[PDB]
Symmetry: D2
Subunit: 288 residues, 4 copies
């Protein structure tokens, strides 16, 4: 089982010097660094090439996360936005291929954060979304990428809030490259059972995000890690597990994540690295 | 210990025929019915008295919940809005006195739902609100009403997200009639420890909301009810416990609570009643004594 | 599911006026009353028939538990003992048949409590037990009785301490009416996973005892009830669930169960009744899907 | 806090080459090695000193555990036995002083394992034990040793089974060098609440043993480690945390601990080393601060 961390645990914006984090994460022992997709369309082939070489040189595998903007919304009623959305993932998936990245995840079937002042048409968005994703999946297949649909809590999405919904949506899409992605932070709000959600995901589970109830590093909170380890084994999960802790206020990230108190308690970079490493030790011990 | 349920469990709007629910609730065995405050300002003294009369007749105690509108936002930098807010509350409080309800709770220090497409000024809203609430605290005291500030999760508010912040804020307000309020649904998100949060609230805890991780009635979910019960015994809690389940899509309630799937699983009113009563027995059994 | 309670929750000896308890549990709403086997061998035909009629007239099903004496030890190396044991069970099972009882459970593959003053021979005891149980099974079968082997903690038995061991032992016996029986109080000690244990027992699970970690009535302690209910659902368990609370000091029961403090907090009979009933309500509410 | 492991994790008899284990746990990274008191009485002053020196050299602190024999029973109604027991501990304590050991724990107020064959007289034994312990306490104070009374499950002792009973006994003894000692294995069986037991022990808590429900190394079982960490922080625990895993069949340890299956599942010495090391990391991580 491969273990990673989202670079944003250290940064307040959806972009960073990924080569720097690739190096940090390697020294700390992770197998994976997960990066945000948004600066990738602004990279020259030269940059893509060197990011790839840097990760390869450091033994790090790269996975991608992405919170789509309203304009990249595959479920939109506006046919133009859906058109632009498809172009965006087509381009992006192509870059992922160049980067030798085989996994992308997040609210890929919608956009994030969601605007609730707006009027919600779930039934509508759900059908348009399923339709758009199947097309994109063609490209994903072609690019050797698993398109992972993350199940999110009610306050961050209205389309898919439980693993059962995720499975229904994926089955309905019905394409090899579209998987379900669960996240302990989100399962904690919506699920009747954590082990049950994993088991429901079953073979469809393609990626796993981890964090405590309030998004701290895995291990000293209330998440039922031992139960998760059991369930993952029950379903023979071989995928990767990426922690995505958010413990700092300020910035696009602090705001989007709604961190309104310093949950890190003044942690400095060295401190942050220490806890992430300890949490990585915990995860390998407990989850496998 | 006194147990109640919020009338919204059965309705999709922030008002309804309370007399109807008082009767249903007395029949299912609850001690309390919690009602939404919004319609109360438009009650004639006659209908206020009939409500109070209904409750007394059915042996039910009434408590009130309230999600403030932006215009009622006591923390708003706009002084006109603060004015409307404080005026609104004193009329409401005075009315509560007439209906002999001694408890109101909710994001009373802010507004709800919150508009997150706006820029957040926590420290600013925080000092304003503290000043605003202390002021309101006086009318609350004269009306014999406990003004409870409910700790909410990050997605529903940004001023008070943990019991520690609720206590800091209530100690700052520094007034006898202002209490911290906890909700198992909100604690499940923000707290390192449920039992620890209750012990942190301690003497200041004046009200408690219950619901499973996903807002189903208490009982078959992951919320740690026994730890809650033991922590309530640790502090010596003397308030009531109101379950606030939300399992239905639709209306302002469904959209305000973000119920995007049929969590009730097709329940008709009679099934909704069965489940509420069973959770009532569960709660009296698991949360008491220790 | 069918829910019961063990009569000993109200008594300090391994026998009592079962009719009194049948009337009691029926009014409290239980489906089952579980009774101790020990006085049955001394029940005359009409006493047996009267107990049966009492159960039937009250909508109550009777189940049976037994802590075997050393003289009833089917795993004994002494062949005479094994012979006496087979004869004791044979007679008992025929009595259960007259009682219209179809389930007996406990450390039926050994004896209880164990004298840990004697040297253990697990392997030898295990093989003799498998043999003896095989032939007793044949008698139970003909009597219409499921023979349930209860998995116990290490301080009360050395042969079968985990659901996995109970499954191994039962597969070896290889008789359809012989089953694995789990108990929340014993799993709490020996199992890595509660739900895991239940899923391990699976189709072989034939009976379930409940109690908190310290044997208080189910619901207000640390036992993972919700996890248990989910796992029972996964294996499709539809059998019986008998709570076995022990909250009082004194007598053979207090001594055998090792209750060395008043866990009941001065509860009187009516107080004990109210608790059981609340626990029944809880069990029915939380354990079913 | 300082973390340790009981040497018996690797041995099947209540004795062993302690020097060897001191060097083993130093390399594995532990702060402490806990050893059985049994062989200490047979130690020349030369032996004592090298052990003391071996510990000091590897930066390992030594703590002592002891399962008293019937002849060492301080609660015994036979005055000759109580006499011999005082003699035994007064000497053991003098030796501990020479080893610079500041802590000893186990069923020091009774004997272990107990013969549940005899007639148990809890009330009598309790009073005898209280008085005897208090006397021994004097010798402990003089030798600068903390006399830790471990609370055990009903199958292994009948005098003290819950932290509440432990605090009562200790408060009755009324002596500064007598502490309550808790063990996650035993609390898991007898306590309503784990965090609650720890808070109940509070300042009387002088030592803590850890292990999963079935005695594997801490970490992948059902013990509520976080709740424990949080409770220890609630009481500002000022002590050591020693893991006491028992995963091997055979010998007096296999028999006394009642290991009737290979819970280690084939582990060789290296494997055990690794698992204990992972458990250590787990423990410092999960149990610290909060
Ligand atoms: O869990 C999520 C946010 O609530 C997402 O996984 C987010 O963090 C990604 O950065 C984009 O979807
Ligand atoms: O918990 C709450 C909303 O998340 C509130 O308690 C809400 O349900 C009331 O209706 C308004 O305070
Ligand atoms: O659980 C058991 C004792 O530990 C048994 O189930 C016992 O209580 C019965 O009375 C005899 O097996
Ligand atoms: O936990 C204990 C008994 O089960 C004791 O701590 C024991 O393991 C020691 O060896 C007795 O000193
Ligand atoms: Mn995520
Ligand atoms: Mn609430
Ligand atoms: Mn309790
Ligand atoms: Mn109780
Ligand atoms: Mn049992
Ligand atoms: Mn111990
Ligand atoms: Mn913490
Ligand atoms: Mn922390």
């Amino acid at each position: 089982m491969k273990h990673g961390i989202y670079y944003a645990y250290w940064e307040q914006e959806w972009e960073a010097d990924y080569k720097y984090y690739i190096e940090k994460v390697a020294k700390l022992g992770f197998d994976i660094l997960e990066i945000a997709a948004s600066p990738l369309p602004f990279y020259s082939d030269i940059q893509i090439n060197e990011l790839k070489a840097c990760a390869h040189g450091n033994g790090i595998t790269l996975t991608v996360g992405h919170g789509p903007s309203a304009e990249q919304n595959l479920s939109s009623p506006d046919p133009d936005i859906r058109k632009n959305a498809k172009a965006f993932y087509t381009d992006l998936l192509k870059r992922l291929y160049k980067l030798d990245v085989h996994l992308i995840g997040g609210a890929l079937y919608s956009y994030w954060p969601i605007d609730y002042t707006k009027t919600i048409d779930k039934k509508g968005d759900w059908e348009r979304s399923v339709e758009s994703v199947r097309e994109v999946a063609k490209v994903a297949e072609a690019c050797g990428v698993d398109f992972c649909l993350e199940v999110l809590n009610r306050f961050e999405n209205y389309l898919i809030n439980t693993a059962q919904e995720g499975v229904d949506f994926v089955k309905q899409v019905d394409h090899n490259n579209v998987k379900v992605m669960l996240d302990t932070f989100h399962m904690n709000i919506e699920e009747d059972s954590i082990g049950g959600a994993i088991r429901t995901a079953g073979s469809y589970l393609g990626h796993l995000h981890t964090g405590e109830c309030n998004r701290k590093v895995p291990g000293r909170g209330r998440i039922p890690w031992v139960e998760i380890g059991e369930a993952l084994a029950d379903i023979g999960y071989n995928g990767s597990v990426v922690m995505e802790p958010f413990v700092r206020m300020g910035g696009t990230v602090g705001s989007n994540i709604k961190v309104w108190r310093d949950i890190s308690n003044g942690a400095d970079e060295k401190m942050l690295d220490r806890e992430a490493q300890a949490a990585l030790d915990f995860s390998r011990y407990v989850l496998e």
